[PDB]
């Protein structure tokens, strides 16, 4: 029953676009329209290295869902050379059936001392993203991150 509901949600779920903006200035640094949320294939993303100098970035995800969800949410694990560097939890909440929604998250930079150079990070960062509706796992996907 839970297996069937997770299948139904993923079948009706679509990631339309995503972008990253500098939080202070609002200028779009990167935009993707690929469904980087597809579970089977490891996706690649090439983001400008100036992203690392931003005091904070705003990430916007636009998605559609045929199925209603009560507590739509995300868990992200950031791996650097296979070691978990960071863990993030984001909550959207209630998704109206057949709706299309924009979800904005603010991600503030660590102090300058703890920031890692683009030359060290590039190609060695994997972002594993799990999409959930409460405690129900809908999908897992991975993106390999390059800084160019």
């Amino acid at each position: 029953a839970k297996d069937e509901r997770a299948r139904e949600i993923l079948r009706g779920f679509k990631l339309n676009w995503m972008n990253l903006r500098d939080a202070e200035t609002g200028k779009i640094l990167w935009q993707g329209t690929e469904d980087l949320s597809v579970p089977g294939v490891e996706h690649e993303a090439r983001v400008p290295k100036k992203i690392l100098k931003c005091k904070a970035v705003s990430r916007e995800l636009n998605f559609s869902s045929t199925e209603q969800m009560e507590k739509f949410r995300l868990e992200q694990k950031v791996y650097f050379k296979g070691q978990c560097l960071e863990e993030w939890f984001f909550e959207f909440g209630f998704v109206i059936p057949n709706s299309t929604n924009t979800w904005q998250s603010l991600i503030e930079a660590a102090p300058e001392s703890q920031m890692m150079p683009a030359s060290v990070l590039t190609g060695n960062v994997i972002i594993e993203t799990k999409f959930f509706d409460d405690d129900l796992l809908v999908s897992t996907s991975r993106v390999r991150l390059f800084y160019v």
Partner: protein
């Protein structure tokens, strides 16, 4: 100058009023006191820190739904009182705990279990039964006699220490989230 709202709950006749009067006025029921008992503000020093205890005896208010809701929402810590000669009052304890937990929508509400009237020889609730219940909840158990004053301060002071542990834990978590919630991307 921090105010701790302490709420004394338990079945009728267990000694909630007697315990409160003994904390506040340093004496057992004696002379006539026409005072309507609800809440009382008392300055005390616990472990070298001066604080204000806002102590609510719920004997009157427990019968009224909106009053119960209010004292369970506003209370920071709860004395859950039974009498050691009344097995029914001990059986009622879990009802009070579950109500408080539901109203506050939290699993670690500061509480102390109190077995009152320990001056009486006709005991029907063993110290071990009571200790087991308290261990099952992860809270202190203290035996009191409002009549002799045994354990009265200990009961209320232990509850304040439980509130302080809770408050100190919440402030460390708030700091720990601030530090953790920054990215290297």
């Amino acid at each position: 100058g921090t105010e701790y709202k302490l709420v004394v709950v338990g079945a009728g006749g267990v000694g909630k009023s007697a315990l409160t009067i003994q904390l506040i006025q340093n004496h057992f029921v004696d002379e006539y006191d026409p005072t309507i008992e609800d809440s009382y503000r008392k300055q005390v020093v616990i472990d070298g820190e001066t604080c204000l205890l806002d102590i609510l005896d719920t004997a009157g208010q427990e019968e009224y739904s909106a009053m119960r809701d209010q004292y369970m929402r506003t209370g920071e810590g709860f004395l859950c009182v039974f009498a050691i000669n009344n097995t029914k009052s001990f059986e009622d304890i879990h009802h009070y705990r579950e109500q408080i937990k539901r109203v506050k929508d939290s699993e670690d509400v500061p509480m102390v279990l109190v077995g009152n009237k320990c001056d009486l020889p006709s005991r029907t609730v063993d110290t071990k039964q009571a200790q087991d219940l308290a261990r099952s909840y992860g809270i202190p158990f203290i035996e009191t006699s409002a009549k002799t004053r045994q354990g009265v301060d200990d009961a209320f002071y232990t509850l304040v220490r439980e509130i302080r542990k809770h408050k100190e834990k919440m402030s460390k978590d708030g700091k720990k989230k601030k530090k953790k919630s920054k990215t290297k991307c």
